[PDB]
Amino acid sequence: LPITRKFYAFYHAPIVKFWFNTLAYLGFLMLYTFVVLVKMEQLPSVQEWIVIAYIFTYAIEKVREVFMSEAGKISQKIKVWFSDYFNVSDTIAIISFFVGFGLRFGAKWNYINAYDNHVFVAGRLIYCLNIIFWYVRLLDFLAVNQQAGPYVMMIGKMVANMFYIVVI
Amino acid sequence: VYLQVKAISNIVWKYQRYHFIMAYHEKPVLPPPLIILSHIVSLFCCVCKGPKLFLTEEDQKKLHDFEEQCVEMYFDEKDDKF
Amino acid sequence: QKSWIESTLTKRECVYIIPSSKDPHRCLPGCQICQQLVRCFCGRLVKQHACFTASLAMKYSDVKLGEHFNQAIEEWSVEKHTEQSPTDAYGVINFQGGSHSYRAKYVRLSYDTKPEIILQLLLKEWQMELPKLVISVHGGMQKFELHPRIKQLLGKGLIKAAVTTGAWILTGGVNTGVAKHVGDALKEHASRSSRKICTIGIAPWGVIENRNDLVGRDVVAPYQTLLNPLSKLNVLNNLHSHFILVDDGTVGKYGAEVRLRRELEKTINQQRIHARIGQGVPVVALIFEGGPNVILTVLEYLQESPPVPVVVCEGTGRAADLLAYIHKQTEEGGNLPDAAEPDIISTIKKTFNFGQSEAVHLFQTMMECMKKKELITVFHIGSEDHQDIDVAILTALLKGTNASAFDQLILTLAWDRVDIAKNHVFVYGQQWLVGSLEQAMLDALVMDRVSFVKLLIENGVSMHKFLTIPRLEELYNTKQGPTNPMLFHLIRDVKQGNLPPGYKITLIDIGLVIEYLMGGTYRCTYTRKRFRLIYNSLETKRFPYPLNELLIWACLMKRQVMARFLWQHGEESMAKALVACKIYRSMAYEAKQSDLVDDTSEELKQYSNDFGQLAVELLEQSFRQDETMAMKLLTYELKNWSNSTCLKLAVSSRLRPFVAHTCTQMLLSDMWMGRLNMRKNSWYKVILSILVPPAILMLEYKTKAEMSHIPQSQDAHQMTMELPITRKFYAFYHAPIVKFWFNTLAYLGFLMLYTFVVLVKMEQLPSVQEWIVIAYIFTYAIEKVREVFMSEAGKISQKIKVWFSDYFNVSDTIAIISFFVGFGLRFGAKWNYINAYDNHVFVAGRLIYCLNIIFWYVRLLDFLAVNQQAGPYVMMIGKMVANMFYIVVIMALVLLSFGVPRKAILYPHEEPSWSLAKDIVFHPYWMIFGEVYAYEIDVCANDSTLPTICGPGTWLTPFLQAVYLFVQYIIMVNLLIAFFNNVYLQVKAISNIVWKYQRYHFIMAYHEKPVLPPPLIILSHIVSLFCCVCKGPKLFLTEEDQKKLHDFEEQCVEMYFDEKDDKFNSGSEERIRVTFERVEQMSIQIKEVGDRVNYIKRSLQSLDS
Amino acid sequence: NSGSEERIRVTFERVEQMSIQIKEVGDRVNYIKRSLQSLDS
Ligand SMILES: CCCCCCCC/C=C/CCCCCCCC(=O)O[C@@H](COC(=O)CCCCCCCCCCCCCCC)COP(=O)([O-])OCC[N+](C)(C)C
Ligand SMILES: CCCCCCCC/C=C/CCCCCCCC(=O)O[C@@H](COC(=O)CCCCCCCCCCCCCCC)COP(=O)([O-])OCC[N+](C)(C)C
Ligand SMILES: CCCCCCCC/C=C/CCCCCCCC(=O)O[C@@H](COC(=O)CCCCCCCCCCCCCCC)COP(=O)([O-])OCC[N+](C)(C)C
Ligand SMILES: CCCCCCCC/C=C/CCCCCCCC(=O)O[C@@H](COC(=O)CCCCCCCCCCCCCCC)COP(=O)([O-])OCC[N+](C)(C)C
Ligand SMILES: CCCCCCCC/C=C\CCCCCCCC(=O)O[C@@H](COC(=O)CCCCCCCCCCCCCCC)COP(=O)([O-])OCC[N+](C)(C)C
Ligand SMILES: CCCCCCCC/C=C\CCCCCCCC(=O)O[C@@H](COC(=O)CCCCCCCCCCCCCCC)COP(=O)([O-])OCC[N+](C)(C)C
Ligand SMILES: CCCCCCCC/C=C\CCCCCCCC(=O)O[C@@H](COC(=O)CCCCCCCCCCCCCCC)COP(=O)([O-])OCC[N+](C)(C)C
Ligand SMILES: CCCCCCCC/C=C\CCCCCCCC(=O)O[C@@H](COC(=O)CCCCCCCCCCCCCCC)COP(=O)([O-])OCC[N+](C)(C)C
Ligand SMILES: CCCCCCCC/C=C\CCCCCCCC(=O)O[C@@H](COC(=O)CCCCCCCCCCCCCCC)COP(=O)([O-])OCC[N+](C)(C)C
Ligand SMILES: CCCCCCCC/C=C\CCCCCCCC(=O)O[C@@H](COC(=O)CCCCCCCCCCCCCCC)COP(=O)([O-])OCC[N+](C)(C)C
Ligand SMILES: CCCCCCCC/C=C\CCCCCCCC(=O)O[C@@H](COC(=O)CCCCCCCCCCCCCCC)COP(=O)([O-])OCC[N+](C)(C)C
Ligand SMILES: CCCCCCCC/C=C\CCCCCCCC(=O)O[C@@H](COC(=O)CCCCCCCCCCCCCCC)COP(=O)([O-])OCC[N+](C)(C)C
């Protein structure tokens, strides 16, 4: 097999696209964990810019997934994609992040002490809560294993079945 | 309830492994930071220019035989057991 | 042309047009009705020709101006006047029937085709396998329907002799009479012989309907089953799978393919039935309900090189029945009684009116036939006369060639028909040649014909005289049967990689493979010096135990059914079952460790696990018979299997059900005791007698006769010849039970000291405890080095890789290496004299001790795992840690999903610090264990212990922690309870077996150990080095006890096979099914005795007359 | 006695004995139908 053919065989394999996305996603959380645990100044740090860029482009991808999906009726493609658990979480996670960035970046810094501006606080506290969506999304990557994945689906089938015991 | 939710979850897991694997044939090659290049390149070639099983005509013949031969063995072995 | 056919085969087009009778039918104008009517002496009218020589000729008159001189009318012969041209009809017809689209392969060839060409088409193009038999059916047409029973029998028998002998039933094709009954017979016994019987109808292109439809080069051409309401024409029949559509002229003329059928009845005769068999493919003729020209055709067969015999089916029809009676009423090989012509010619007359002009002319075609009775056969239907025609047909080709029984046998061997060999070839009076059954055996072994290998042994073939070196070399170097293609990949991997093209495998090369697949110190009979000499020189070339050399052959060639045959034959059954388990297990590992399209490992591991179960089921058989001798069956040296041991072979294959069998576990229990009877002693007294030496001489030992089934050391066996005092101490201290408790007390005393050194102040120099402690670990390490050297396979790397596979032996190296780092830092460090722990080399040394000790408590689980109850729980713990892994990874993610939002909301003003990696993980982990941090929740409350953390957004954290614990405690901890409850029983069953299995390696390690524990062991080490530069257990039987044991082995294998059938036969599934089959046979007979009595009650009023 | 294991096994053993006899009464009647053309003499 020639050389340039041998690269086209690697990068276009679904196994490679996976691990090439996991490392970007794990590197993404390591950065977004860092931005959320460390002091957040007036302007976003280089981490937080790398982090916004991911979520922005990650959202362009989801839009592209919905268009290039299946049955040409726009409403059908919609109703299919919003039936998976994590794809609902992705929209809340994407929408919530750009509210928080709008409030974070769109806010008059006080210069005496941060967190006297409640637009700024509200922006950060959305980040600190939006990140929960992005750890739980690792269960979608871990659900690629033959042993792990059935436990992940199982958790939810049990939460639904224990409901009435928990109401008592 | 463990055993029966574990049996359902193994099947729902195996079933959703189609939609997952087949979604990673359509995805670009670059992950979501650098994906935008792949997006732009796919818009360039949109205003400038899924997987299928290719058989030669003799392999289609050998396959339709295999289909027929296995249906025969199915009905034959169903009565031979009954 | 993209078809071998078109370049090769042709058609026939009647280029030349000739008059008919010359009468224009009626209707005065004659010139044009000549065009309307005149069937060419071809047989199709002038315009049906369409020929190019005859297309632009009708304008003038046609071919042949005017009368053409009556002589020359008698000149159309297709040869001069009909042209060979490219085929135009070859494809696949399709029949319209219930769920079967029955296919075929029509060809449309000229009758002039060379007979070589035909057989080629049949074999390569149509991809047919050369048959082991050809049943050419010849009979009469439109023979309405046979009687119900006689149709059943000719419908089961033809199918049974064609499905078992892979035969080509050559036919006529026309759906009338013969092909009509052949086809219905196929349909009544189809789908068991569907893709096994190939039925070639050789039909003419004359009497053929939808003739124009079959035309079409390379097509899936259609075809019907609606018999044309008006027509004398004939339709091809449903179930014929192939068609030879000969063409010379047109419709009618149903006599131009007869010669071509004869060609294919010849060209198959010149092919060899099998690559090893010299006999030609047989050909037989089957007559049922014939015709006037059958008895002519019958005559032709029995007068050729060689005489194609004939099997006639009386009771069906006219010619058969005629031919039935005549040859039946014949002299032994000749003429008749006082002239029988009056009845014969009268009998011939009623079938066919001939009338003494040619009714005599039949008597000549009817004499040479019956004169050849030896070649003629007849199936007397309704008289159990060779049990449908399958016996009779196949029999016909064995009795009627005056052939040697060597050839008659080999034909059955190519047919795989043992019954016809055992009932007609091995019959009384048969006289064989010196080594002819041997040549049959060699062919049966190569061809993988187990049922003939059985027969040839049962009659007289001795495998001791049979099996030689140059022969048993052949058996490896064959491609004429089921082969293991990996045997070359193995013989490559041992002979450095180089295999020349020929490379006739040698037994020495097979010995090298058996050493590599059996591993360790195994030395085969083929790699020895005594064989490499006799071998390269070439009773001596005959092996002493031949059925042990072929068991390996059948296994290396992946021939299980032959392996499961040759195993019952001979002795050392349980040994061979555990070898085979080992050969297939290693063959399987090297198949998975290689690149290949067919993995052939689930096949081999199943083959391994099939013999592994035979050994266990024979051990359970020996154990239920005698327990003491069954334990002896585990430890006697084999002497044909590299001085090995049936137990050692099972441990070599990780065949846990055999080592976990109660017999081995009870022998293992008795080797643990030693010479001590721990049934009339207690562990209190063993410990007491270790601490009080003279209490060794007050406890109960075992006699020499309670130690005969136990493998011993030589020195131990030399002290069973005499018990004196110094002998009584040698029996105590060398018992594995005593070496254990003598090591536990040193190890428990070791931890008590090392616990003391680690809890108490550690001064500049080590205390007397810490010196005693270092000494142990130092000498304990010397022991582990000695364990690795004196272990097993001489390859240093193997001994390494085995010892580092046990859990605790990995821990021992970390524990030993870590201790002498800590001692090097502890002892190698400048004491400060102001206060210790200002020197960080010294601290680091102590903190390694304080952590190294964890290795040494956990090592007590290795001592506690000696108990039958405790040990399976210890192995179980680890099997569960591995299985709970992914639940705990989810629990670690819910942890970080909570600790990162919490630390971020409660500590917003943090610069980057390593304390951020603790605080996201610390409190959320201690929450899993019931610490709620109650007064840190709601940091803005009045009872809060973190009142300074109160700020914007901190009201979120109690909501977050409420979700957190609900997930961790109410879902995830209880999911893990649910996990354990539903996996408990099966991990507990595995752990009991893995426990019982590893009790071999443990007990057998305490035979090799010195007598002194790891502090004082160094004496035993030194003494063992002194006697190394100055100077395991075996089962000793006397020669009469070896005799009594080989008997016990034989007797228990017999009881195993006997009791296996006695259970199978005495089962309701077997008793319902043979009852089922008898009630069938009876019912048939009851409606036949019921018929006869209906032919008796008619004979009450006839006798009344 | 009133169990299927016992009723299959004695049925099994009777069908054996019968079948033997049915191929012996079947033999005798084959030695009777020969005695239709002999008595005919
Ligand atoms: C599957 C895929 C799904 C896709 C889902 C995607 C959904 C995306 C959803 C998006 C929702 C976005 C909501 C943002 C909220 C803004 C409010 C705000 O901050 O107001 C403040 C800033 O007001 C300003 O005008 C700031 C202007 C400078 C900053 C630029 C804003 C960037 C917006 C981001 C663009 C996001 C890009 C989105 C890309 C996707 C006002 O507060 P103040 O200034 O303190 O007081 C003003 C009053 N005064 C005048 C009296 C003083
Ligand atoms: C299955 C079986 C497997 C077997 C596995 C066995 C594996 C065994 C593995 C062994 C690894 C051993 C690693 C030890 C680390 C030593 C480093 C150290 O302490 O350095 C210090 C002492 O430096 C000295 O030179 C001290 C010399 C006196 C003490 C003697 C050391 C004894 C080593 C024990 C021999 C162990 C015997 C092993 C027997 C087996 C340096 O620090 P300092 O002095 O405070 O400062 C110096 C700085 N200055 C120069 C500027 C002043
Ligand atoms: C198969 C099993 C393998 C393990 C797998 C799991 C990986 C485990 C990895 C865990 C990460 C821990 C990283 C430590 C961060 C640096 C620590 C440090 O700098 O000093 C601290 C170390 O001293 C201590 O006392 C704390 C040590 C951590 C204890 C962990 C307990 C929880 C277990 C968690 C288990 C759940 C894990 C969930 C998944 C991630 C001391 O305090 P500080 O403030 O940090 O620094 C000093 C400053 N000061 C003097 C002012 C105080
Ligand atoms: C069953 C029992 C419930 C009854 C039903 C009715 C609901 C009742 C609720 C009603 C909400 C209104 C209460 C606000 C009171 C005034 C503001 C105030 O004091 O805020 C306080 C906090 O609280 C907050 O800041 C807001 C809390 C909102 C979440 C409440 C739960 C929502 C419903 C359920 C959600 C579950 C999920 C929903 C899906 C199912 C501020 O006080 P602090 O925190 O001590 O800090 C002050 C000091 N500082 C200035 C330094 C910071
Ligand atoms: C979108 C796709 C992302 C994919 C990744 C690619 C992008 C990543 C590449 C580059 C981005 C990083 C830019 C760094 C800029 C400098 C920052 C700075 O000033 O100092 C910081 C340095 O930086 C760090 O310590 C790293 C911060 C992020 C933590 C996670 C890194 C791993 C994740 C991603 C990679 C792993 C791969 C994951 C695969 C398994 C901190 O400095 P400090 O010394 O701690 O400060 C002293 C503290 N003091 C003041 C209290 C004394
Ligand atoms: C499509 C999806 C939904 C989008 C919803 C819309 C989102 C955008 C919403 C709102 C627009 C932003 C308002 C601008 C602020 C005006 C007041 C101001 O100037 O500053 C004041 C802010 O006082 C506060 O109380 C700020 C609270 C902001 C957080 C609330 C939004 C949470 C969104 C829910 C999450 C949704 C996540 C997505 C869920 C899927 C005070 O600061 P200052 O003025 O600088 O100085 C002090 C002056 N003062 C003391 C005299 C007061
Ligand atoms: C610069 C960077 C350098 C490199 C970076 C290295 C990064 C390392 C990255 C990842 C670590 C895992 C490596 C093991 C992979 C094993 C192989 C595999 O594919 O197994 C499975 C895993 O399939 C997955 O999709 C796993 C996804 C892991 C991401 C989730 C992290 C969990 C964090 C939560 C925990 C919190 C604690 C986290 C710590 C704070 C899939 O295999 P399978 O489907 O079974 O197919 C085989 C089937 N067969 C056996 C029949 C053939
Ligand atoms: C701060 C951070 C905290 C930690 C983060 C933890 C992250 C989360 C961790 C793990 C997530 C597990 C992955 C889910 C897998 C998919 C399941 C799915 O699609 O839906 C499942 C259901 O729906 C659910 O199960 C909903 C999600 C359950 C999360 C549990 C929240 C409980 C807390 C609230 C209480 C708190 C009390 C306190 C209140 C203040 C599928 O169900 P089904 O049976 O297939 O079909 C349903 C239909 N039926 C009903 C007819 C059967
Ligand atoms: C390598 C294999 C080893 C095998 C064992 C053979 C070697 C063992 C033999 C001898 C070694 C011991 C030498 C002792 C030297 C004197 C020490 C000293 O000065 O005082 C110590 C005395 O000693 C003890 O109290 C015992 C210390 C070890 C702890 C337990 C040993 C038991 C295990 C081994 C034996 C049983 C085996 C059990 C088996 C089931 C302590 O004195 P104190 O009075 O506490 O101090 C007052 C405290 N105050 C200052 C605060 C007031
Ligand atoms: C083959 C297996 C691997 C072996 C690895 C190699 C092992 C050997 C490793 C290292 C060799 C020893 C180095 C000597 C110390 C040099 C510094 C010194 O002299 O003193 C300094 C010590 O300062 C420290 O920080 C000491 C820390 C020592 C512990 C680290 C080793 C842990 C090994 C991991 C465990 C592995 C266990 C085994 C795992 C299987 C200071 O003390 P001082 O000088 O007296 O006075 C103060 C002066 N000062 C304040 C100005 C500074
Ligand atoms: C100077 C000194 C004087 C004497 C000292 C006396 C020293 C006393 C020494 C030991 C105490 C145990 C004595 C009971 C023995 C019972 C008999 C036996 O063999 O049972 C089994 C134990 O087999 C073992 O190997 C047990 C090993 C014990 C060491 C682990 C200690 C646990 C510490 C952790 C706990 C922490 C707490 C620790 C304390 C802080 C083996 O038997 P079996 O395989 O079942 O074979 C019989 C089968 N049958 C029934 C079918 C026939
Ligand atoms: C300080 C003192 C602490 C207390 C001391 C305790 C001492 C320990 C006590 C008892 C030890 C139990 C004896 C083990 C028996 C042998 C098992 C074996 O060989 O391996 C088993 C596996 O591997 C293991 O099970 C590894 C050992 C498990 C120890 C548990 C550590 C968990 C802590 C970490 C988390 C901490 C979180 C916090 C992080 C900071 C066998 O597995 P298998 O199934 O046969 O085969 C595996 C292959 N498979 C995967 C395909 C199935």
At C308, the amino acid letter reads: V
From residue A36, give the alpha-carbon distance in Å to each of A30, A86, C891: 10, 22, 22
Structure-block tokens of residue C468: 């030689």
CA–centroid distance for C1077 within its chain? 30
Chain A interface, mutation test: which of C900, C967, C974, most A Cβ atoms within 10 Å?
Answer: C900
User: How many whole angstroms from C919 Cα to the centroid of ligand 3?
Assistant: 8
Instruction: Give the largest CA-CA distance in chain D.
Output: 57
Three-class SS state of C109: coil
Which backbone phi and psi does C468 adopt, to 5 degrees? -125, 175
Q: How far apart are CA C428 and CA C417, in angstroms?
A: 19
Do C1082 and D33 make contact, defined as CB atoms within 8 angstroms? no
Atom of ligand 4 nearest to the CA of C955: 44
Q: How far apart are CA B38 and CA C333, in angstroms?
A: 94
- B62 CB-side CA count, 13 A: 5
Tell me which DSSP letter residue C330 carries: S
CA dihedral C852, C853, C855, C857 (to 10 degrees): 180
Q: C712 has which bridge partners?
A: C1034
Question: Who among A23, A53, A157 is closest to B8 (CB)?
Answer: A157
Q: Helices A85-105 and A118-136: crossing angle, nearest 10°?
A: 160
Question: Residues 6 or more apart from C353 whose CB is under 8 A from it?
Answer: none
Residue in the block written with tokens 């060839």: C109
Q: How far apart are CA C1062 and CA C69, in angstroms?
A: 90
Q: How far apart are CA C620 and CA C477, in angstroms?
A: 39
Q: How far apart are CA C856 and CA C751, in angstroms?
A: 7
Structure-block tokens of residue C687: 């410990």
Q: How far apart are CA C207 and CA C209, in angstroms?
A: 7
Q: How far apart are CA C362 and CA C380, in angstroms?
A: 23
Which backbone phi and psi does C375 adopt, to 5 degrees? -90, -15
Element (H, E) at C347: helix C341-351
Q: How far apart are CA C341 and CA C320, in angstroms?
A: 18
Q: How many CB atoms lie within 10 A of CB C339?
A: 10
Q: How far apart are CA C36 and CA C706, in angstroms?
A: 113
Q: Cα dihedral sign for C260, C261, C262, C263? A: positive
Pair C903, A37: CB distance under 8 Å: yes
- Residues of B in CB contact (< 8 Å) with A are 1, 5-6, 8-10, 12-13, 20-21, 23-33, 35-36, 39
Q: Helices A148-161 and C974-1008: crossing angle, nearest 10°?
A: 140
Burial state string for C108-124 with b = 16 or more CB within 10 A and e = fewer than 16: bbbbebebebbbebbee
Q: C12 has which bridge partners?
A: C84
How was this structure determined? It was done by cryo-EM
Q: How far apart are CA C646 and CA C573, in angstroms?
A: 10
Contacts of B72 in chain C (CB under 8 A): 191, 194
User: How many whole angstroms from C898 Cα to the centroid of ligand 1?
Assistant: 27
Pair C914, C922: CB distance under 8 Å: no
Residue in the block written with tokens 């008997």: C1047
Which backbone phi and psi does C308 adopt, to 5 degrees? -45, 110
Tell me which DSSP letter residue B40 carries: H
Q: Is C1077 left (phi over 0), alpha (psi -120 to 50) or beta?
A: alpha
Burial state string for B13-32 with b = 16 or more CB within 10 A and e = fewer than 16: beeeeeeeeeeeeebbbbbb
Q: A39 has which bridge partners?
A: none
Q: Helices A14-37 and C885-906: crossing angle, nearest 10°?
A: 30
At C33, the amino acid letter reads: I
- Closest-CA residue, ligand 7 atom 15, reads A145
From residue A107, give the alpha-carbon distance in Å to each of A55, A60, A146, C126, C986: 21, 26, 47, 84, 61
Instruction: Give the largest CA-CA distance in chain A.
Output: 67
Q: Cα dihedral sign for D26, D27, D28, D30? A: positive
Q: Cα dihedral sign for C490, C492, C495, C501? A: positive
β-pairing, C135-138 vs C89-91, is: unpaired
Pair C440, C409: CB distance under 8 Å: yes
Contacts of D39 in chain C (CB under 8 A): 1103
Chain B interface, mutation test: which of C2, C3, C100, C191, most B Cβ atoms within 10 Å?
Answer: C191
Three-class SS state of C1014: coil
Chain C residue with Cα closest to B73? C191
At C631, the amino acid letter reads: M
User: How many whole angstroms from C906 Cα to the centroid of ligand 2?
Assistant: 47
Structure-block tokens of residue C988: 């507990």
Which backbone phi and psi does C703 adopt, to 5 degrees? -70, 170
Q: C542 has which bridge partners?
A: C468
Question: Who among B5, B25, B29 is closest to A157 (CB)?
Answer: B5
Three-class SS state of C200: strand
Q: How far apart are CA C166 and CA C219, in angstroms?
A: 28
CA dihedral C286, C327, C302, C110 (to 10 degrees): -40
Structure-block tokens of residue C1034: 């075996």
DSSP per position, C633-660: TTTS--SSSTT--HHHHHHHTT-HHHHT
Question: Residues 6 or more apart from A147 whose CB is under 8 A from it?
Answer: C885, C886
Helix %, strand %, coil % of chain D (to 5)? 75, 0, 25
Q: How far apart are CA B19 and CA A143, in angstroms?
A: 13
Kindly report the nearest CA distance between residue C983 and chain A, in angstroms: 14
User: How many whole angstroms from C213 Cα to the centroid of ligand 5?
Assistant: 80
Structure-block tokens of residue B52: 């299928």
Do C191 and B2 make contact, defined as CB atoms within 8 angstroms? no
β-pairing, C10-13 vs C83-86, is: antiparallel
CA–centroid distance for C531 within its chain? 32
Structure-block tokens of residue C285: 């003729």
Element (H, E) at C90: strand C89-91
Residue in the block written with tokens 């408590």: C857
Structure-block tokens of residue B71: 């249906």
Question: Residues 6 or more apart from C79 whose CB is under 8 A from it?
Answer: none
Q: C61 has which bridge partners?
A: none
Chain D residue with Cα closest to C1103? D40
Q: Is C9 left (phi over 0), alpha (psi -120 to 50) or beta?
A: beta
Contacts of B1 in chain A (CB under 8 A): 158, 161
The residues after which chain B has a C–N gap greater than 2.5 Å are: 49
Q: How far apart are CA A90 and CA A139, in angstroms?
A: 13
- Closest-CA residue, ligand 6 atom 38, reads A96
At C491, the amino acid letter reads: I
At C526, the amino acid letter reads: Y
Residues D12, D15, D18: CA angle, nearest 5 degrees? 150
β-pairing, C242-246 vs C284-288, is: unpaired
- Per the document, the length of chain D is 41
Tell me which DSSP letter residue C954 carries: G
At C527, the amino acid letter reads: T
Residue in the block written with tokens 């009817």: C366
Question: Who among A20, A57, A68 is closest to B36 (CB)?
Answer: A57
DSSP per position, C612-636: HHHHHHHHHHHHHH-HHHHHHTTTS
Which backbone phi and psi does C345 adopt, to 5 degrees? -65, -30
User: How many whole angstroms from C747 Cα to the centroid of ligand 10?
Assistant: 30
Pair C273, C282: CB distance under 8 Å: yes
Q: How far apart are CA C91 and CA C108, in angstroms?
A: 10
- Per the document, the length of chain A is 168
Q: Cα dihedral sign for C606, C608, C614, C616? A: negative
Structure-block tokens of residue C245: 């559509």
Closest to C404 in 3D by CA, of C431, C377, C428, C423: C431
Q: How many CB atoms lie within 10 A of CB C308?
A: 25
Structure-block tokens of residue C430: 């048969």
Tell me which DSSP letter residue C224 carries: -
CA–centroid distance for C3 within its chain? 39
Closest to C10 in 3D by CA, of C110, C91, C104, C82: C110
Q: C1029 has which bridge partners?
A: none
Three-class SS state of C241: coil
- C1052 CB-side CA count, 13 A: 26
Which backbone phi and psi does C172 adopt, to 5 degrees? -100, -30
Q: Do chains D and A touch, with touching meaning 3 or more CB–CB pairs less than 8 Å apart?
A: no
Closest to C1046 in 3D by CA, of C665, C648, C616, C570: C570
Structure-block tokens of residue C130: 């050369």
CA–centroid distance for C555 within its chain? 11
Q: Cα dihedral sign for C560, C562, C563, C568? A: positive
Question: Residues 6 or more apart from D1 whose CB is under 8 A from it?
Answer: none
Q: How far apart are CA C836 and CA C822, in angstroms?
A: 16
DSSP per position, chain A: --HHHHHHHHHTSHHHHHHHHHHHHHHHHHHHHHHHHS---SS--HHHHHHHHHHHHHHHHHHHHHHTSSSS-HHHHHHHHTTSHHHHHHHHHHHHHHHHHHHHHSS---SS-TTSSHHHHHHHHHHHHHHHHHHHTHHHHHTTSTTHHHHHHHHHHHHHHSHHHHH-
Closest to C1002 in 3D by CA, of C699, C651, C729: C651
The residues after which chain A has a C–N gap greater than 2.5 Å are: none
Q: Is C50 left (phi over 0), alpha (psi -120 to 50) or beta?
A: left
Instruction: Give the largest CA-CA distance in chain C.
Output: 152
Give the chains touching C; criterion: ≥3 Cβ pairs < 8 Å.
A, B, D
Burial of C30 (0-12, 13-18, 19+ CB in 10 A): exposed
Question: Residues 6 or more apart from C492 whose CB is under 8 A from it?
Answer: C499
Q: What is the CA radius of gyration of chain C?
A: 45
Three-class SS state of C84: strand
Give the 3-state secondary structure of C1019-1040.
HHHHHHHHCCCCCCCECCCCHH
Contacts of C1074 in chain D (CB under 8 A): 12
Element (H, E) at C391: helix C388-399
The ligand 7 site (C-beta within 6 Å) comprises A 22, 138, 141-142, 144-146; C 889, 892-893, 896
Q: How far apart are CA C479 and CA C276, in angstroms?
A: 11
Closest to C173 in 3D by CA, of C231, C108, C101, C113: C108
User: Helices marked H in C701-839 — which ranges?
Assistant: 714-718, 725-733, 736-759, 768-789, 796-803, 807-827
CA–centroid distance for C602 within its chain? 10
Q: How far apart are CA C1046 and CA C1041, in angstroms?
A: 9
Element (H, E) at C507: helix C507-518
Contacts of C1066 in chain D (CB under 8 A): 9
Question: Residues 6 or more apart from C842 whose CB is under 8 A from it?
Answer: C825, C826, C829, C831, C836
Q: What is the CA radius of gyration of chain D?
A: 17
CA–centroid distance for A147 within its chain? 24
Q: Is C449 left (phi over 0), alpha (psi -120 to 50) or beta?
A: beta
Tell me which DSSP letter residue C911 carries: P
Do B76 and C978 make contact, defined as CB atoms within 8 angstroms? no
Tell me which DSSP letter residue C281 carries: P
Structure-block tokens of residue B62: 């050998």
Q: How far apart are CA C218 and CA C210, in angstroms?
A: 17
Residue in the block written with tokens 């493609």: A77
- Closest-CA residue, ligand 2 atom 6, reads C817
Do C887 and A151 make contact, defined as CB atoms within 8 angstroms? yes
Question: Who among C191, C979, C981 is closest to B72 (CB)?
Answer: C191
Closest to C138 in 3D by CA, of C261, C264, C244, C239: C261
Do B3 and C982 make contact, defined as CB atoms within 8 angstroms? yes
- Residues of C in CB contact (< 8 Å) with B are 191-192, 194-195, 978-979, 981-982
Which bound ligand lies closest to the C-alpha atom of C823?
2
User: How many whole angstroms from C741 Cα to the centroid of ligand 11?
Assistant: 9
Burial of C662 (0-12, 13-18, 19+ CB in 10 A): middle
Pair C875, C865: CB distance under 8 Å: yes
Contacts of D9 in chain C (CB under 8 A): 1066, 1068, 1071
Question: Residues 6 or more apart from C10 whose CB is under 8 A from it?
Answer: C84, C85, C86, C87, C109, C110, C112, C113
At C810, the amino acid letter reads: V
Resolution in Å, one decimal place: 2.6
Q: C247 has which bridge partners?
A: C110
